[PDB]
Design a protein around this ligand. Structure first.
Ligand SMILES: [Mg+2]
Ligand SMILES: [Mg+2]
Ligand SMILES: [Mg+2]
Ligand SMILES: [Mg+2]
Ligand SMILES: [Mg+2]
Ligand SMILES: [Mg+2]
Ligand SMILES: [Mg+2]
Ligand SMILES: [Mg+2]
Ligand SMILES: [Mg+2]
Ligand SMILES: [Mg+2]
Ligand SMILES: [Mg+2]
Ligand SMILES: [Mg+2]
Ligand SMILES: [Mg+2]
Ligand SMILES: [Mg+2]
Ligand SMILES: [Mg+2]
Ligand SMILES: [Mg+2]
Ligand SMILES: [Mg+2]
Ligand SMILES: [Mg+2]
Ligand SMILES: [Mg+2]
Ligand SMILES: [Mg+2]
Ligand SMILES: [Mg+2]
Ligand SMILES: [Mg+2]
Lengths: 100, 152, 208
RNA sequence: CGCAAGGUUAAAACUCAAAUGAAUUGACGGGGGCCCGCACAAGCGGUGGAGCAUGUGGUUUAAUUCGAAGCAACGCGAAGAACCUUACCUGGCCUUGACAUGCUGAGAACUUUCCAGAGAUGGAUUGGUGCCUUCGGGAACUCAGACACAGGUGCUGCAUGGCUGUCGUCAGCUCGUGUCGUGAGAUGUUGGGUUAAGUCCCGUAACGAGCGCAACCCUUGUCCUUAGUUACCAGCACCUCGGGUGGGCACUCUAAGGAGACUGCCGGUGACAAACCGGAGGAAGGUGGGGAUGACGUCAAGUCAUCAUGGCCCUUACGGCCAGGGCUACACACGUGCUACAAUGGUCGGUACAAAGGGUUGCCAAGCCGCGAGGUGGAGCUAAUCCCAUAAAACCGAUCGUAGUCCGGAUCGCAGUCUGCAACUCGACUGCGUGAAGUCGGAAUCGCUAGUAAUCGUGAAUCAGAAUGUCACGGUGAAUACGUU
RNA sequence: GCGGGGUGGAGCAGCCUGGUAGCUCGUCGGGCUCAUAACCCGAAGGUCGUCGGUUCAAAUCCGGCCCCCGCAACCA
RNA sequence: AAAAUG
């Protein structure tokens, strides 16, 4: 959880979000059955133009306080070993211990 | 259990015959909770018994269990240096359990088309005693006289 | 063995959550992040003031913060030139507008967080820990406090081996859910490492 | 002295800082006595044999990145390694730096649609000179320089905090005052019963108290009150025969508040006590079933790699950026699993009944085109309202006839679908064809006492994709317990 | 020249009386144990000295040869 | 009935 590594994933977040439209248009044109092989191929070229650091697959979500790559809960934003610490203090609304 | 507070549940759900031993035999032949499979298999076996056997099949069944139940059972006890065996009279409730278990486990080992006619075959064999279950019963019985020395 | 957090096990039963609002699949994570950031920032900034409970409420697109402190004079100085800067800063952090209400708490020696902080800052000043434990326990027991336990762990003094000490007085039943056991932990940073302080305070039974 | 064995009298050098007696607390015993626990015993089903998944040890490699090591490591951190993750290797590329503050100068961010480069990067690139103005100026943002710095998943868990396992959910562990002993200490807390319990009763130099046990919390099983849409349909009517429609507050159901179970009543035993064994009633009877809850402490137990922190260490590098590769390697060994070795079965046809949950950077219906995984399509839904979504084992009829087979599916060849910049290393499924080991498994070893075992299916987390793993929910549904050596 | 023999890496059964090679110690792997030793269970490893003949067929029956012995004997 | 050692 080195801060350089957090910085380089946050910058990945900006790089992914800052296009947000050329990916959609190009992939929609590619997946459109009636667009001709020319618009297939130019769209492939266009997709290969932009940096690889733009896709959502490259984006590994992390804890917002520690950045632990493992043990994530996307309903919250915290990691495995901070969600419990915050919950025992009652900070998380409507969270208790369950028996049933 | 050391406490001896564990009571027993009573099961009696004979569908049509309204008997008692039949249901316990059902449970013995039931495997992995396949109760209806046991229903149809045992009832086909009993139908074959009824068509082969002139009389009703339930008294033939109880007579067959009468010839498989062991009167005495041998049980190993170690004297502290030697491996002995001791013959003891079987608990009256335990006789039916041994009878059912032996009959089922011996009907399982025939090797013919299905175990319905296997169960019929050993039900008729045990009706007088030319089967293999009666063979094991008499072997276990004769082990008692073979070890009558200790008894006490 | 280990013991469950006494505040968490009593959540809903006798204790109350420190952040009461409602959110949905989108804004829930953002609201939790804002709450955690605001709480740590407020604690760090008003460390000098004796702040214990930061209660957060969220009405429609708004936010209300109430502060439980033993010293309200520092925050409320010469008719409001302090809380307003805080309001503006919190609105810089919290997108929604904020609202502040400074709540003063009597009997600070009956609040676990304050006792823990005082003991920790005493140990930071190279004071013997047994004297601090005795003084805190006696101060707590002069008024109310049907029971109190204080535990301190670490390299007490300057020894190069860690150990744990604790002193109790009265009754502190942790296995009874009716009892509202106030509980707190804190860390004291010394030249030889970290010292952990835990405080349990028993107020009374809740009946009916 | 004695026949001999040997007896009697009896030193020193040297060497050590102890040797020793009695009693106390604990631990232990192939010492004793009571009691408990799937601990045995009585049963059911497995592992160890075969194929495959997954982790570990060892070997090789450029790396196979770290950590976890009897029970208490080995489907463990990891609730998801194609790139990223990533901490390792090869090569390329930076030096106050990807990031914080402090000084100086130039200026907007933005949008610039191009070239070289595996890429970091370097060089053109129309456009705007900004906001507010003490109109002087100023805040923010980008770049250049300079130091104080920044940085480290680098070592020490035997310097620490926090968190966790374990004995063990076993019934114990202590204190004040008093008393006994020269003291370490002891009584309380021993004893007769009884209980799941240091639970309770009676006695009693002890009298009282605290942390444990029990109770308060959640859920499940009965009933009552309120509630009736999107949930329900007993009655009435219409109906195109779909609670479909009008309609109702009957019912189920959903969710809030209450009643009820307390050895309460009767019989016997019992020191006429605690309690035990029966009976009635009751949906439930003896803490009704399950959960959460883990005392004083032990193992210098685990973690410095989630985090924080005392020290020590590098600063052109042990700090950063980018391409590929490895963590999925392979003469072997071990743990945990899935599938089988078949007839209580494998195929074919139509057929009936669940619970739980997830969905507006989402579910994705109808229709149409494909044997097929899928594709176009766009409906409904912020959801008891629409979608995921057809449960399966079970039952009836037909066939196979016990044969390594109408079993079993590994392996392999060819051709495909889908997400992803990209499926060689190294993804999941689909179609045709090929078709293995396996005939129920040695020494040894494991889990389980009633909705239990066994067996059948469904859902969620992580997640673009990837589950035989984890967590969770229902269907069918047993056998056995005389007893404590 | 008398008598006896030859088979897993070492040592014994199987011959006789024809068709079937097992056992012990070793090596390897795995069990038991907190761990080691002891102990238990698997696996590999022998076409039987060789040649010829008998014999339907041979580790087995007969001989040639070779080797081993107990050998008397030999013993610089 | 077996059980040597650290
Ligand atoms: Mg850090
Ligand atoms: Mg990903
Ligand atoms: Mg003892
Ligand atoms: Mg047993
Ligand atoms: Mg196996
Ligand atoms: Mg194996
Ligand atoms: Mg490793
Ligand atoms: Mg496990
Ligand atoms: Mg430790
Ligand atoms: Mg620790
Ligand atoms: Mg005295
Ligand atoms: Mg004592
Ligand atoms: Mg005691
Ligand atoms: Mg008690
Ligand atoms: Mg309790
Ligand atoms: Mg009763
Ligand atoms: Mg250690
Ligand atoms: Mg890389
Ligand atoms: Mg790995
Ligand atoms: Mg088949
Ligand atoms: Mg061995
Ligand atoms: Mg020795």
């Amino acid at each position: 959880a080195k801060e350089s590594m957090k910085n380089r994933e946050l910058k990945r977040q900006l790089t992914v979000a800052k296009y947000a439209k050329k990916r959609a248009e190009l992939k929609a044109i590619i997946a459109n059955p009636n667009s001709s092989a020319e618009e297939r191929w130019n769209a492939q070229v266009a997709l290969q133009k932009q940096p690889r650091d733009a896709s959502a697959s490259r984006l590994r979500n992390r804890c917002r306080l520690t950045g632990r790559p493992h043990g994530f809960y996307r309903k919250f934003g915290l990691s495995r070993n901070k969600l419990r610490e915050a919950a025992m203090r009652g900070d998380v609304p409507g969270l208790v211990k369950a028996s049933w | 259990p050391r406490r001896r507070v564990a009571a027993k549940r009573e099961v009696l759900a004979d569908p049509k015959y309204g008997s008692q031993i039949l249901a316990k035999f059902m449970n013995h032949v039931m495997e992995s909770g396949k109760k209806a499979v046991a229903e149809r298999i045992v009832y086909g076996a009993l139908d074959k018994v009824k068509e082969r056997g002139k009389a009703d099949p339930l008294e033939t069944f109880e007579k067959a269990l009468d010839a498989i139940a062991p009167l005495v059972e041998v049980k190993s006890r170690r004297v502290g240096g030697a491996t002995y065996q001791v013959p003891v009279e079987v608990r009256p409730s335990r006789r039916n359990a041994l009878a059912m278990r032996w009959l089922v486990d011996f009907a399982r080992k025939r090797g013919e088309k299905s175990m319905a006619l296997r169960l019929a075959g050993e039900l008729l064999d045990a009706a007088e005693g030319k089967g293999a279950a009666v063979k094991k019963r008499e072997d276990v019985h004769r082990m008692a006289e073979a070890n009558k020395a200790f008894s006490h | 063995g280990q013991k469950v957090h006494p505040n968490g096990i009593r959540l809903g039963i006798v204790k109350e959550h420190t952040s009461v609002w409602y959110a949905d699949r989108k804004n829930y994570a953002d609201y939790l992040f804002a709450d955690l950031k605001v709480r740590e920032y407020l604690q760090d900034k008003l460390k000098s003031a004796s702040v214990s409970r930061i209660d957060i409420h969220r009405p429609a697109q708004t936010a209300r913060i109430t502060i439980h402190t033993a010293r309200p004079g520092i925050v409320i100085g010469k008719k409001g030139e302090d809380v307003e800067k805080l309001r503006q800063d919190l609105t810089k952090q919290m997108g929604v507008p904020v609202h502040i209400n400074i709540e003063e708490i009597r009997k600070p020696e009956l609040d676990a967080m304050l006792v823990a902080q005082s003991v920790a800052q005493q140990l930071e000043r190279r004071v013997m820990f047994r004297r601090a434990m005795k003084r805190a326990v006696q101060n707590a027991m002069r008024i109310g406090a049907k029971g109190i336990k204080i535990q301190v762990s670490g390299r007490l003094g300057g020894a190069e081996i860690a150990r744990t000490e604790w002193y109790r007085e009265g009754r502190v039943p942790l296995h009874t859910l009716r009892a509202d056991i106030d509980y707190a932990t804190y860390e004291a940073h010394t030249t030889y490492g970290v010292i952990g302080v835990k405080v349990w305070i028993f107020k009374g039974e809740v009946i009916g």
